[PDB]
Design a protein around this ligand. Structure first.
Ligand SMILES: Nc1nc2c(ncn2[C@@H]2O[C@H](COP(=O)(O)OP(=O)(O)OP(=O)(O)O)[C@@H](O)[C@H]2O)c(=O)[nH]1
Ligand SMILES: Nc1nc2c(ncn2[C@@H]2O[C@H](COP(=O)(O)OP(=O)(O)OP(=O)(O)O)[C@@H](O)[C@H]2O)c(=O)[nH]1
Ligand SMILES: Nc1nc2c(ncn2[C@@H]2O[C@H](COP(=O)(O)OP(=O)(O)OP(=O)(O)O)[C@@H](O)[C@H]2O)c(=O)[nH]1
Ligand SMILES: Nc1nc2c(ncn2[C@@H]2O[C@H](COP(=O)(O)OP(=O)(O)OP(=O)(O)O)[C@@H](O)[C@H]2O)c(=O)[nH]1
Ligand SMILES: [Mg+2]
Ligand SMILES: [Mg+2]
Ligand SMILES: [Mg+2]
Ligand SMILES: [Mg+2]
Ligand SMILES: [Mg+2]
Ligand SMILES: [Mg+2]
Ligand SMILES: [Mg+2]
Ligand SMILES: [Mg+2]
Lengths: 221, 221, 221, 221
């Protein structure tokens, strides 16, 4: 039995997180608008929808931001076989996104299982939302720096020195109010099955908040 | 650290085997010739070549047949991390094949690592070649049945009941001598870097045989 | 990094189940009373108590029956490292039991992690209790058969043919009422820390029952 | 199937390394000679011998030093199941050592599988022997410090600061020439079946050396 990891398994509930491999370069090459591009974001949400619709697996919902998607699973696919789940889902995502962006050169996602207790499920997504936000700010800050005639290394360097408030200040000065930028850039996008139509929510609440908590709770059941 | 399998690793030498998931249905739509179609076989060999060419990983070679490819790895990618290797390679394969076949609907590979001792490396491929043969015959048997007015299930029962000799005889009666068919249908295709151009060998020797042994031995180093 | 499984981890809550290796033979040899021996049972409960008291790990409680002990863990030891947890706990159990039975020849436990959702924790132990019961009956039936001048193989053979009721009948006929045999033989023994004194309960309720449910619920918190 | 790691396996050749857990404290009570004690070393070699003799498993040989033993396995026990192998072997070792030292308080080993290519097998043991040496020197350094009126922490600081030459010099000044000490303290002990009696070699060659190479090579076959 040389296929030693082909037995490794998991238990419900689990979260599959797939992240685009080397997407910084691969998206710089093709000429995507920076720091955000609604075509790419729509491609990713459409990828998630297509997964929920035609993968033959049954996630409760997907949450996507940046170059990554997370699928909540209660019903485990492939008997919980980690290799099979990770590989198949990553492959399907690669194919789907390749279709949706009409790519001429191949791309790849990485995938990983996150084992969780049910009670922990909101926190995880909260964490992820936070990360999304932390991308948002940085993504714009960085941009502004490059627009002010800065080198890449210098921009990263300076970007580390100042914290979120100072970045807000810098961006607000130059005409960019981060609070009025679209919801999906700072909070991400939810894709879920409802009573059955698959719907994309592009205006989701902040998870750890008054409207966010029952929202997530209703998503999870 | 909820990402429990994200640290799990392997050791050289390893073989990554990716197998097309449910390729029967998802690819049936376009009308590929049955039981073998050089357009699909060329697509798979092209996928393997493209992997060797632009993945940024370094397999020694690929061996492909049916809907599957095996990559020999001595230099392990991603520090030998099983999740990352399986997911990323499967994903890249999905993307590549989606490009080469210009697919409108998404597909997926499953992937798995096969842990091996160097001494076992030839045997594995021999095993795989054997499987290829077992595919070959079977693939034709079924086909013949379809031309002779058979139900799919009807085709399954008989095919399971009789062994290779009687099947060979049937195919010869129904007009098909398997010995006149091209080498790659029964032996598969090798993709490797040679004297340096990446080359597809569509006329490979039987691995466990007098000309096959030094061939494989030179492939592996 | 040749120590590939040294990274494999888990998440709370988990149950460690250790089972005496080849204990049938090893206990037949030393001359333990069959089918139950309160000296061995006391040794096992004392082993569990000693584990809770001096292992330096922190299970919520242990449940023991036959040649096996299960430890409920909420606080995970050794960062959840499966190898380290299994090996260390198995080793400690071997040592402890070796002390308590004053053994001249070495013994071993096997160990395994059971990954569970909190909501599933009662069911598991219920399952185990059921198994305990299924041992109980069989253990006596078997005994009776050997007492009626039967060979081992014949006794097992016949034992499979009849179900629990018929066994109850057989044993009740020969003077043995299974309902009046001690609680620990049919329900097992609980060992837990209380507000801190470690106490052994040798008269536990049936878990799936009116008195059993709040009992287990109070054990788990 | 909540027992998710219970299927995880490995491939030959493998090395099981068991290391005494917290042996500093738990064994300190009896008053073992420091920094080395032939009673404990004999106990460990006896444990390895007893394992080879009555475990029912079949290692090729054991190598032991300090509080640790390594077993070379080509024939894998328990179908190569990692949980079962680690837990059972660790447990047996705990029991055996508990018997040979006649302990009143329980002890534990941790265990781990080391996956190796045959070509790597000597190197591993070389590495281990190196570790043995690094133990040896250090073990004495500390000791000397204790005789020269040092705090434990005080002993740690200096010992970390200086490298082997200066330490050698210190020990020579404080009366101890390490070259006159017995071979096993710096090289460890081998336990293997020989011409067939199970034998303990307490005078083994340096593994990576002219006489060591054919020695190890004959041990491994
Ligand atoms: N231009 C552009 N870039 C994007 C967009 N969304 C995500 N990205 C890129 O995605 C990256 C997200 O960080 P990472 O996932 O760590 O980047 P990566 O190259 O994929 O790194 P790895 O996944 O580890 O290979 C950012 O650096 C962005 O440049 C987008 O909408 N437009
Ligand atoms: N028409 C056609 N079909 C092919 C060709 N090559 C492979 N296939 C199909 O691919 C299938 C391969 O079977 P498997 O890989 O064992 O399993 P699967 O059908 O892909 O389903 P999975 O278990 O998810 O992999 C066969 O049933 C074939 O029908 C081809 O060249 N032409
Ligand atoms: N005489 C006697 N035997 C007992 C007692 N408790 C448990 N056993 C033995 O323990 C066995 C329990 O079944 P198993 O755990 O599958 O037996 P095993 O030999 O340990 O099998 P493995 O664990 O797979 O190696 C029974 O066959 C009993 O004979 C006892 O109190 N007295
Ligand atoms: N007195 C005495 N102590 C020994 C002897 N051999 C080994 N030891 C002790 O065993 C310890 C081995 O250290 P490690 O195996 O690295 O770690 P540990 O102290 O056992 O703690 P763990 O990390 O749980 O293994 C040393 O600190 C020694 O003090 C001996 O022969 N005599
Ligand atoms: Mg990325
Ligand atoms: Mg990312
Ligand atoms: Mg397939
Ligand atoms: Mg196939
Ligand atoms: Mg047992
Ligand atoms: Mg048992
Ligand atoms: Mg130790
Ligand atoms: Mg040690």
């Amino acid at each position: 039995t040389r296929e030693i990891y082909a037995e490794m398994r998991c238990i419900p509930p689990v979260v599959l997180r797939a992240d685009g491999r080397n997407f910084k370069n691969t998206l710089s090459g093709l000429g995507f608008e920076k720091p955000y591009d609604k075509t790419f974001a729509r491609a990713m949400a459409d990828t998630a929808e297509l997964f929920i619709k035609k993968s033959g697996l049954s996630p409760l919902f997907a949450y996507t931001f940046s170059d990554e998607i997370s699928f909540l699973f209660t019903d485990l696919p492939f008997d919980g076989r980690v290799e099979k789940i990770d590989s198949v889902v990553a492959s399907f995502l690669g194919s789907a996104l390749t279709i949706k962006l009409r790519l001429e050169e191949p791309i790849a996602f990485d995938s990983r299982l996150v084992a969780l207790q049910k009670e922990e499920i909101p926190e995880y997504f909260h964490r992820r939302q936070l990360e999304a936000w932390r991308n948002f700010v940085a993504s714009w800050g960085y941009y502004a720096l490059r627009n002010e005639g800065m080198g890449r290394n210098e921009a990263a360097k300076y970007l580390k020195r100042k914290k979120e408030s100072e970045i807000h200040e810098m961006l607000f000065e130059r005409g960019i109010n981060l609070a009025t930028l679209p919801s999906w850039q700072r909070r991400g996008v939810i894709i879920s099955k409802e009573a059955r139509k698959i719907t994309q929510n592009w205006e989701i609440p902040k998870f750890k908040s008054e409207k966010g908590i029952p929202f997530l709770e209703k998503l999870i059941n």
